[PDB]
DNA sequence: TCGCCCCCCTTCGGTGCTTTGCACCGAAGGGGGGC
C-alpha cells in the first residue's frame, strides 16, 4: 500500500539540474531480483516507466537483507544527493534500553516496505530516473522513475521519519499510557495493560497504520521475550547486547584493528572496564588500511584483558524513575576512564568509558571533569536528568583545584569513593616565595630563522649556566630553561621566567602532555618539595632577569 | 495587518544549528508551550524539508515560577538584515543609567500579535528533542514576530511607542528603554513608590497585551597597588610587571626608578628598602591609577567586548572595552547565593549582570571573552540563565601573569 | 559501488595571537552500532 499522506515538497539546489549517470553491469541473479521487485513495484504503483523525454539516470544495485532470502534494491544517488536540497534531520539520536522503563506488556513491530509506502513529491520524481540492465548487451535496459521514497536518496530517511511521526500522532494522543519507541520503521510498544487489553491496542495501532499504507507483517511482529530491538535483547527484568564477536587474527591489518576497536567501544556500553588506548595507538602513523601492523605487547595485554571481560555474561537493567541515578567513575591509567550508571548497587543500567585526550597538556582532574561532563550529557539524553556522582577524588583535592585554577570549573552533587588509584594533583605551586630556597632567574631564546637557541639561568646563591640547543623554537627554549633550573636545584626552589607561555602551561598543573619535553618538566615538578614560580616582563632590565637575559645572549 | 518585508544580509543563509539535549522538565515545558502556541496560530508544525534550525530551551526565574521558552536566535540575528539600514530600530536614552532604580519587564508577548513575513518564517525553525530519542524531534516555525529575534522590536517599534505614549507623558521623569523582549524602566522614586508605578505600567500593558537594579551603586574598580611597610624583591618584581602592563592603558607610567632597585641577581625574599625616588615614583603611579583615563569615549558603531577574570572568594573582575586597553568600564562582581561553591553559576550570573549593565548604559550587550572551557560552560550554563536575551561569547584560556585587577 | 542517525580514535587544516609556533577546534578519514 502507498500512504495517502501528503507528499513533502523537495527541491534541487539552485542552478543545479538532475543526475545523468550510467548503469553499471550486474549479475543475472541480481537482475532477476530487481526485475521481480521492479515489475512488482510497477504493479503497486511504486515506480512508473519513463521514456527519452526524461534525460536523467542513476545507477541501481542490490544487496541481501538479514531476512536472509530477500533482496534490498538500492540506487547510487550520490550525484542526485549532492544536487538535492539540504534537510534538517529529525533523528537526533539513538534510543538506549537503559532508558526504557519496566513494562507489563511489550510488543515490537516493523513496517513492511517502509520507504516504498511513502509517496514522493510528484515534481521531483523525474530526477529519480534509473534503469534495470538485464545482462547488458542484448537490450538497452528498461527505465523507470520512483513514485515513492527511494533507498539511497538523501531525503528519504527524514521524510519517512516525519511521515511516521504524523501517522502515529493521533494514536499517541489517544493512548498517552502506551510508550511507542519509534526508530525509523521499527516500533517498540510498551504498556502496563494486561496482555489482552494490550493486544487490543496493538491491533488498533496496526489497523491505524494500515489505513495509512503501513503494513506490519507477522514475521516482524514480536510478541514474546526476548525482544530483538536496536541490537539488544529485551527481557522483562533486564537487557543484553546481541553477541559481540571480536576478530581473531594471527596477522592484523590497520583495518582489522579499526574494526576491533569499534567493537570494543560498542561493548563498553555494558561491559565495564573496556580499554582501547593501546590497540588504538597501533593506528597512529599508519599509511594504509591493509598495512600489517604488529601488535605491541601492551596491545596484546589490553586485548587479553578485554577478552576476559567479554567472556563474562553481563546485562543491564531498566530505568526506575522513582529512584536516583548514580554514576561512578574509576581511573584506569594513561588518560582512560570507565564508569557505571546504576540506581541499585551492582545492577548497572549501562556502563561506558572516557579516554579522549583534549589539549596538548592536561591533568587527571581536568579529564575527570570531562568524564563527568560526558556522563552528564549522556544522562540528559537517556533519562532527562543528571546523576549523582561517586568519584575517586577527595573533596580536599577538588577544593584545591578550583581555587588555584584561574578558569571557572565545577562538578555537580558528588560523593567521594575510595577506589584507588585516586585522582589527585601531582604537585602544587607555592603562592608565596619560599624563604631559604635558591632563586633561579631563567631565560631561553632561539634564533627564529636559524633553529638555534640558548637556555640558561643565574642564581642568587651565585650559580651560572648556559646550554646550547639545536633545532628548537622560541617557546621550547623557555621550557628548557625551566627544565634546567628544576634539574640543578634542591627540593625547594624559587624560579623567575619571562615566558607567559611557559607560566601558562606549568601553572595549569599538568600531569601529562603530548610533548616529551613538557613531560620531563612534569616529572621534575613532581619530585620537588616546594616550588614558587614567578614571571617578569622581558627586556626591561629587571635585576636577575637582566643578568640571565644578558647571559643567554 | 500587512507584513514587513525582511531579508537576510546579502550572501548569507539561514541558521543551521543543532538542538542540544534538554532535561525532562524543560522538554515538558516546551511541549506544553509550543502546543498552546500551535493552537493560537503563533507557530506551525513543519517537516525536514525546511533545512534551518535554531536551538530551543527553557528558563524559569525563581521570582516567576513559570517556565519561559527561550529560542537562541543569536545566529539568525547576525544574519538578519539591519533595520538601521532600513530605519526601523530603537534609540537609547542617556538618562536610564542615571536612575536610582531600574526594573526589567518581559514584554515578549506583545510581538505575538504581529504576523511575520511569510518568506522569512522558514528561518525561524526549531526542534523539540525527545527523552531517550523515543521519537524524532518535532519541528515548528514562527508565524508571528518571534521572541528573541532582533527584527521583532524593530517591526513592533511604532506599536510599542503608541502603547507607551500615555504612560511616558503622565510620568515625564520615568525612562523606558526597550531592549529586545525587555523594557528597562528607571526612576528616582523611593523603592516602594517605584514598584507601584511599575505595577501601573504592567496594567497599561495588560489592557492591550523582575527585581530592581541600582545603577547608583555600579562602582568602578581601579587598578590598585599593594600598601605595606616592608617590601621584598618579589613584591617589587610583581609591582613592576604590573605597572608595565598598566603602561598600555594609562599615560606616563614609570618603571625605571623601581627596576633599578632590583639590579643584581637577588633573593626573592630579600627585604629591599624603598628609596625616596622609588617612594616618589610609587605614590605618583598610585595616583594616575586613582582617577580615570583621559581620552576614552563610547563609539556606538563598534561592538562592546567584556573580559572576566576569576579572582576567588566568589569575586570576579571584568572590563568592558571596544579598543584594546581603552576600557569604558572596569568592575568587580561579587556573588551572595549562599554556598560560595559554584563557579559556573557565578560566572553565568556575572555575565547576565555585566550584560545588563551594558544595556542600561550603552543599549546593547558586549561580546564576552569567558574564562572557562567551552564544554564546561555548555554542560551547565542554561541551568542558571534568567534573561530573555543571550549575549555573544567566546572562550579563552588566559593564565594570569599579573593579578592586575586585584 | 546507496541513505540518514548516534558513538570513539586519528588526522588535517583554518584561526588568531600585541605569534614567527602554538593551542584550539571543527571537519573528515577510519571504525562500531541502528533501520
Ligand atoms: N538507503 C538505505 N536505507 C535502509 C537500509 N536499511 C534500512 N533502510 C531504510 C529503508 C527501509 O525501508 C527502512 C526500514 O528498514 P527495513 O530493514 O525494515 O527494510 P523495509 O521496511 O523496506 O523491508 P521489510 O519488509 O521490513 O523487510 O529503513 C540500507 O541499507 N540502505
Ligand atoms: Mg521494515
C-alpha distances (whole Å) from A248 to each of A253, A261, A388, B198, B389 are 12, 13, 39, 75, 57
Rounded Cα–Cα distance for residues B188 and B174 (Å) = 8
* H-state helical runs in A385-489: 395-404, 474-487
Q: What's the distance, Cα to Cα, between the start and end of chain B in Å?
A: 56
Report cis status (omega within 30 of 0) of the bond before A346: no
Together in a domain, A39 and A109: no
Q: Which ligand is nearest to the CA of A111?
A: 2
Neighbouring C-beta atoms of residue B11, cutoff 10 Å? 6
Closest atom of ligand 1 to CA, residue A152: 1
DSSP B19: P
Together in a domain, A366 and A403: yes
Q: Name the 3-class secondary structure at A211.
A: helix
b/e burial code for range B260-278 (CB count within 10 A of at least 16 → b): ebbeebbbbbeebeeeeeb
CB B15 within 8 A of CB B79: yes
Q: Would B5-94+120-160 and B299-405 be classified into the same CATH topology?
A: no
DSSP A289: T
- Structural domain tally of chain A? 5
Together in a domain, A190 and A133: no
A333 HSE (CA, 13 A, CB side): 9
Neighbouring C-beta atoms of residue B370, cutoff 10 Å? 23
Q: At a CB cut-off of 8 Å and minimum separation 6, what does B153 contact?
A: B89, B90, B160, B178, B179, B180, B181
Taking the alpha carbons of A516, A518, A523, A524 in that order, is the dihedral positive or negative? Answer: positive
Rounded Cα–Cα distance for residues A441 and A456 (Å) = 8
CATH fold of B213-298, please? Alpha-Beta Plaits (3.30.70)
Given A288, A319, A350, which residue is the final one in a domain?
Answer: A319
Q: At a CB cut-off of 8 Å and minimum separation 6, what does B77 contact?
A: B149, B150
Distance A288 CA to C28 C1' (A): 16
Together in a domain, A142 and A171: no
CB A119 within 8 A of CB A48: no
Helix (H) or strand (E) holding A210: helix A195-211
Rounded Cα–Cα distance for residues B397 and B374 (Å) = 10
Together in a domain, A417 and A476: no
Rounded Cα–Cα distance for residues A125 and A127 (Å) = 5
Contacts of B54 in chain A (CB under 8 A): none
Are β-strands B367-370 and A388-391 bridged in parallel, bridged antiparallel, or unpaired? unpaired
Together in a domain, A397 and A455: no
Query: Is strand C in 7 Å reach of the CB of A394?
Result: no
Q: Quickly list DSSP for A506-543.
A: HHT--SEES-HHHHHHHHHHHH-SEEEEEE--TTS--T
Which neighbouring-strand residues pair with A330? A338
> Given an 8 Å threshold on Cβ–Cβ distance, is A439 in contact with B266?
yes
Supply the CATH number for residue A246's domain: 3.30.70.270
C-alpha distances (whole Å) from A24 to each of A101, A136, A310, A316 are 49, 9, 43, 47
Given A426, A456, A489, which residue is the final one in a domain?
Answer: A426
CATH class given for the domain over B5-94+120-160: alpha beta
> Given an 8 Å threshold on Cβ–Cβ distance, is B237 in contact with A542?
yes
User: Residues 506-525 of chain A: which lie with beta carbon within 7 Å of strand C?
Assistant: 515
Rounded Cα–Cα distance for residues B93 and B178 (Å) = 10
φ, ψ of residue B316 in degrees (nearest 5): -150, 120
CA angle B255, B260, B264 (to 5 degrees): 135
- Domain of residue A350, residue span: 320-426
Supply the CATH number for residue A146's domain: 3.10.10.10
Rounded to a whole number of angstroms, the CA Rg of chain A reads 32
Q: Cα(B17) to centroid of ligand 1, in Å?
A: 28
B181 among annotated binding-site residues: yes
Rounded Cα–Cα distance for residues A127 and A137 (Å) = 25
φ, ψ of residue A183 in degrees (nearest 5): -120, 105
How many residues are recorded in chain A?
Answer: 553
Rounded Cα–Cα distance for residues A78 and A85 (Å) = 13
Q: At a CB cut-off of 8 Å and minimum separation 6, what does A536 contact?
A: A496, A497, A498, A542, A545, B237, B240, B241
Given A393, A426, A459, which residue is the final one in a domain?
Answer: A426
Query: What CATH code would you report for B299-405?
Result: 3.30.70.270
Rounded Cα–Cα distance for residues A347 and A249 (Å) = 34
Lay out the sheet containing B305-312: strands in order across.
Answer: B326-334, B315-323, B305-312, B367-370, B393-395
> A106: buried, middle or exposed (CB in 10 Å: 19+, 13-18, 0-12)?
buried
> Given an 8 Å threshold on Cβ–Cβ distance, is B371 in contact with A409?
no
What resolution, expressed in A, was reported for this entry?
2.3
Rounded Cα–Cα distance for residues A394 and A364 (Å) = 13
How many residues are recorded in chain B?
Answer: 406
Distance A517 CA to C22 C1' (A): 15
Together in a domain, A100 and A218: yes
Nearest in space to A546 (alpha carbons), one of B210, B41, B259, B35: B259
Together in a domain, A535 and A449: yes
Taking the alpha carbons of A504, A505, A506, A507 in that order, is the dihedral positive or negative? Answer: positive
Rounded Cα–Cα distance for residues A376 and A410 (Å) = 12
**Strands (DSSP E) along A314-460, which ranges?**
316-317, 326-333, 336-342, 348-354, 361-362, 388-391, 414-416, 438-446, 453-459
Together in a domain, A101 and A142: no
Together in a domain, A103 and A220: yes
CB A119 within 8 A of CB A7: yes
Nearest in space to B160 (alpha carbons), one of B106, B115, B110: B110
CB A508 within 8 A of CB A518: no
Distance A286 CA to C22 C1' (A): 25
Which nt has its C1' nearest the CA of A518? C22
Domain ranges, ordered by start, for chain B: 5-94+120-160, 95-119+161-212, 213-298, 299-405
DSSP B159: H
Rounded Cα–Cα distance for residues B79 and B76 (Å) = 5
Helix axes A474-487, A516-527, angle to 10 degrees: 30
A418 HSE (CA, 13 A, CB side): 0
Q: Quickly list DSSP for A114-149.
A: TGGGSB--GGGGGGG-EEE-SSSSSSPPEEEEESB-
CA angle B135, A230, A313 (to 5 degrees): 135
Taking the alpha carbons of A39, A42, A46, A48 in that order, is the dihedral positive or negative? Answer: positive
Q: Name the 3-class secondary structure at A497.
A: strand
CATH fold of B95-119+161-212, please? Alpha-Beta Plaits (3.30.70)
Rounded Cα–Cα distance for residues A150 and A64 (Å) = 17
Together in a domain, A489 and A528: yes
φ, ψ of residue B174 in degrees (nearest 5): -95, 140
Report cis status (omega within 30 of 0) of the bond before A357: no
Q: At a CB cut-off of 8 Å and minimum separation 6, what does A529 contact?
A: A491, A492
* Residue A152 Cβ contacting ligand 1 at under 6 Å: yes
φ, ψ of residue B352 in degrees (nearest 5): -65, -40
Rounded Cα–Cα distance for residues B391 and B368 (Å) = 7
CB A45 within 8 A of CB A2: yes
Q: At a CB cut-off of 8 Å and minimum separation 6, what does A542 contact?
A: A536, B237, B240, B259, B262
**Strands (DSSP E) along B54-119, which ranges?**
56-61, 64-71, 101-106
Cα-based torsion angle of the residue sequence B348, B352, B357, B363 in order, rounded to the nearest 10 degrees: 130
Helix axes A500-507, A474-487, angle to 10 degrees: 60
Rounded Cα–Cα distance for residues A275 and A350 (Å) = 16
Together in a domain, A149 and A49: yes
Q: At a CB cut-off of 8 Å and minimum separation 6, what does B357 contact?
A: B215, B218, B320, B329, B331
Rounded Cα–Cα distance for residues A423 and A400 (Å) = 12
CB B330 within 8 A of CB B292: no
Q: What's the distance, Cα to Cα, between the start and end of chain A in Å?
A: 85
Rounded Cα–Cα distance for residues A225 and B48 (Å) = 35
Rounded Cα–Cα distance for residues B252 and A493 (Å) = 36
Which neighbouring-strand residues pair with A531? A493
Q: What string of H, E and C letters represents the secondary structure of B257-278?
A: HHHHHHCCCCCCCCECCCCHHH
If you measure CA to C1', which residue is closest to nucleotide C18? B324
Which neighbouring-strand residues pair with A457? A442, A465
Amino acid at each position: 500500500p502507498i500512504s495517502p499522506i501528503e507528499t513533502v515538497p523537495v527541491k534541487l539546489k539552485p542552478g543545479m539540474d538532475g543526475p545523468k549517470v550510467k548503469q553499471w553491469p550486474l549479475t543475472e541473479e541480481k537482475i532477476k531480483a530487481l526485475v521481480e521487485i521492479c515489475t512488482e513495484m510497477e504493479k503497486e504503483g511504486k515506480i512508473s516507466k519513463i521514456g527519452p523525454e526524461n534525460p536523467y539516470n542513476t545507477p541501481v544495485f542490490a544487496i541481501k537483507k538479514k531476512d536472509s532470502t530477500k533482496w534490498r534494491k538500492l540506487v547510487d544517488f550520490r550525484e542526485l544527493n549532492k544536487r538535492t536540497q539540504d534537510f534538517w534531520e529529525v533523528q537526533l539520536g539513538i534510543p538506549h534500553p537503559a532508558g526504557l522503563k519496566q513494562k507489563k506488556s511489550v510488543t515490537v513491530l516493523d513496517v513492511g516496505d517502509a520507504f516504498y509506502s511513502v509517496p514522493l513529491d510528484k515534481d521531483f520524481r523525474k530526477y529519480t530516473a534509473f534503469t534495470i540492465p538485464s545482462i547488458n548487451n542484448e537490450t538497452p535496459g528498461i527505465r523507470y522513475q520512483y513514485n515513492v521514497l527511494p533507498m539511497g536518496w538523501k531525503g528519504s530517511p527524514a521524510i519517512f521519519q516525519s511521515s511516521m511521526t504524523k501517522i502515529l500522532e493521533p494514536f499517541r494522543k489517544q493512548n498517552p499510557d502506551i510508550v511507542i519507541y519509534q526508530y525509523m520503521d521499527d516500533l517498540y510498544v510498551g504498556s502496563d495493560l494486561e496482555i489482552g487489553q494490550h493486544r487490543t491496542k496493538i491491533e488498533e495501532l496496526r489497523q491505524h497504520l494500515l489505513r495509512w499504507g503501513f503494513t506490519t507483517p507477522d514475521k516482524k511482529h514480536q510478541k514474546e521475550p526476548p525482544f530483538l530491538w536496536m541490537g539488544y535483547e529485551l527481557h522483562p527484568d533486564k537487557w543484553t547486547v546481541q553477541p559481540i564477536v571480536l576478530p581473531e587474527k594471527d596477522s592484523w591489518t590497520v583495518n582489522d584493528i579499526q574494526k576491533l576497536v569499534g567493537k570494543l567501544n560498542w561493548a563498553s556500553q555494558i561491559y565495564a572496564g573496556i580499554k582501547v588506548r593501546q590497540l588504538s595507538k597501533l593506528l597512529r602513523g599508519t599509511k594504509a588500511l591493509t598495512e600489517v601492523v604488529p601488535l605491541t605487547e601492551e596491545a596484546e595485554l589490553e586485548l587479553a584483558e578485554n577478552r576476559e571481560i567479554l567472556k563474562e555474561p553481563v546485562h543491564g537493567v531498566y530505568y526506575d524513575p522513582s529512584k536516583d541515578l548514580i554514576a561512578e567513575i574509576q581511573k584506569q591509567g594513561q588518560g582512560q576512564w570507565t564508569y557505571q550508571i546504576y540506581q541499585e548497587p551492582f545492577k548497572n543500567l549501562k556502563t561506558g568509558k572516557y579516554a579522549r585526550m583534549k589539549g596538548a597538556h592536561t591533568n587527571d582532574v581536568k579529564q575527570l571533569t570531562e568524564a563527568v561532563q560526558k556522563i552528564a550529557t549522556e544522562s540528559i539524553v537517556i533519562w532527562g536528568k543528571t546523576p549523582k556522582f561517586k568519584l575517586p577524588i577527595q573533596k580536599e583535592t577538588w577544593e584545591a583545584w578550583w581555587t588555584e585554577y584561574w578558569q571557572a570549573t565545577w562538578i555537580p552533587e558528588w560523593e567521594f569513593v575510595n577506589t584507588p588509584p585516586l585522582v589527585k594533583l601531582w604537585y602544587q605551586l607555592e603562592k608565596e616565595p619560599i624563604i631559604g630556597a635558591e632563586t633561579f632567574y631563567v631565560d631561553g631564546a632561539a634564533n627564529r630563522e636559524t633553529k638555534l637557541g640558548k637556555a640558561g639561568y643565574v642564581t642568587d646563591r651565585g650559580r651560572q649556566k648556559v646550554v646550547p640547543l639545536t633545532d628548537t623554537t622560541n617557546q621550547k627554549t623557555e621550557l628548557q630553561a625551566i627544565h634546567l633550573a628544576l634539574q640543578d636545584s634542591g627540593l625547594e626552589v624559587n624560579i623567575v621566567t619571562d615566558s607567559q607561555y611557559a607560566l601558562g602551561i606549568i601553572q595549569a598543573q599538568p600531569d601529562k602532555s603530548e610533548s616529551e619535553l613538557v613531560s620531563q618538566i612534569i616529572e621534575q615538578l613532581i619530585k620537588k618539595e616546594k616550588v614558587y614560580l614567578a614571571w617578569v616582563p622581558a627586556h626591561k632590565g629587571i635585576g636577575g632577569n637582566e643578568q640571565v637575559d644578558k647571559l643567554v645572549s | 495587518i500587512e507584513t514587513v518585508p525582511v531579508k537576510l544580509k546579502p550572501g548569507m543563509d539561514g541558521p543551521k544549528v543543532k538542538q542540544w539535549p534538554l532535561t525532562e522538565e524543560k522538554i515538558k515545558a516546551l511541549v506544553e508551550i509550543c502546543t498552546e502556541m500551535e493552537k493560537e496560530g503563533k507557530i506551525s508544525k513543519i517537516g525536514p524539508e525546511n533545512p534551518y534550525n535554531t536551538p530551543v530551551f527553557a528558563i524559569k526565574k525563581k521570582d516567576s515560577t513559570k517556565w519561559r521558552k527561550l529560542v537562541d536566535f543569536r545566529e539568525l540575528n547576525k544574519r538578519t538584515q539591519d533595520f538601521w539600514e532600513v530605519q526601523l530600530g530603537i534609540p537609547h536614552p542617556a538618562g536610564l543609567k542615571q536612575k536610582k532604580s531600574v526594573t526589567v519587564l518581559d514584554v515578549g508577548d506583545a510581538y505575538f500579535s504581529v504576523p511575520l513575513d511569510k518568506d522569512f518564517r522558514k528561518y525561524t525553525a526549531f526542534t523539540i528533542p525527545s527523552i531517550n530519542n523515543e521519537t524524532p524531534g518535532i519541528r515548528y516555525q514562527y508565524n508571528v514576530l518571534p521572541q528573541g529575534w532582533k527584527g521583532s522590536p524593530a517591526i513592533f517599534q511604532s506599536s510599542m511607542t503608541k502603547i507607551l505614549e500615555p504612560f511616558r507623558k503622565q510620568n515625564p521623569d520615568i525612562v523606558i528603554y526597550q531592549y529586545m523582549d525587555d523594557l528597562y524602566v528607571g526612576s528616582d522614586l523611593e523603592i516602594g513608590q517605584h514598584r507601584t508605578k511599575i505595577e501601573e505600567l504592567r496594567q497599561h500593558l495588560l489592557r492591550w497585551g523582575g527585581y530592581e537594579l541600582h545603577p547608583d551603586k555600579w562602582t568602578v574598580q581601579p587598578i590598585v597597588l599593594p600598601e605595606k611597610d616592608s617590601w621584598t624583591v618579589n613584591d617589587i618584581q610583581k609591582l613592576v610587571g604590573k605597572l608595565n602592563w598598566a603602561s598600555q592603558i594609562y599615560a606616563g607610567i614609570k618603571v625605571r626608578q623601581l627596576s633599578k632597585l632590583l639590579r643584581g641577581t637577588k633573593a626573592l625574599t630579600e627585604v629591599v628598602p624603598l628609596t625616596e625616588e622609588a617612594e616618589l615614583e610609587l605614590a605618583e603611579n598610585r595616583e594616575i591609577l586613582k582617577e580615570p583615563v583621559h581620552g576614552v569615549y563610547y563609539d556606538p558603531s563598534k561592538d562592546l567586548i567584556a573580559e572576566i577574570q576569576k579572582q576567588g572568594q566568589g569575586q570576579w573582575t571584568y572590563q568592558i572595552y571596544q579598543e584594546p586597553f581603552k576600557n569604558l568600564k572596569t568592575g568587580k562582581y561579587a556573588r551572595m547565593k549562599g554556598a560560595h561553591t559554584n563557579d559556573v553559576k557565578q560566572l553565568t550570573e556575572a555575565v547576565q549582570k555585566i550584560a545588563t549593565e551594558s544595556i542600561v548604559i550603552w543599549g546593547k550587550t558586549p561580546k564576552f571573552k569567558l574564562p572557562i572551557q567551552k564544554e564546561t560552560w555548555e554542560a551547565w550554563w542554561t541551568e542558571y540563565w534568567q534573561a530573555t536575551w543571550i549575549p555573544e561569547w567566546e572562550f579563552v584560556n588566559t593564565p594570569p601573569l599579573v593579578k592586575l585587577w586585584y
